[PDB]
């Protein structure tokens, strides 16, 4: 299976139940 | 040269090495 | 509308703009 793109917010994202968390939110 | 959906455990995941590692893992 | 595959060097990255970081610059 593939995942697909993370928003372009100049935001980190973490790959958690197929979608994109900000990374901060594990900061 | 896409990569794969990462399970959905409710966990998050960071890309290296071609895999799906747990962020906490990095907390 | 999927991300392309971060690098396989063993470093963990973050989807962010499109791009993968390296999440220890998160931590």
Same mark, same amino acid.
């Given at each position: 299976?593939?995942?697909?793109? *993370?928003? %372009? &917010?100049?935001? *980190?994202?973490? %790959?958690? &139940?197929?979608?994109?968390?900000?990374?901060?939110?594990?900061?």
């Amino acid at each position: 299976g593939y995942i697909p793109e *993370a928003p %372009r &917010d100049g935001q *980190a994202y973490v %790959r958690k &139940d197929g979608e994109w968390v900000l990374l901060s939110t594990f900061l």
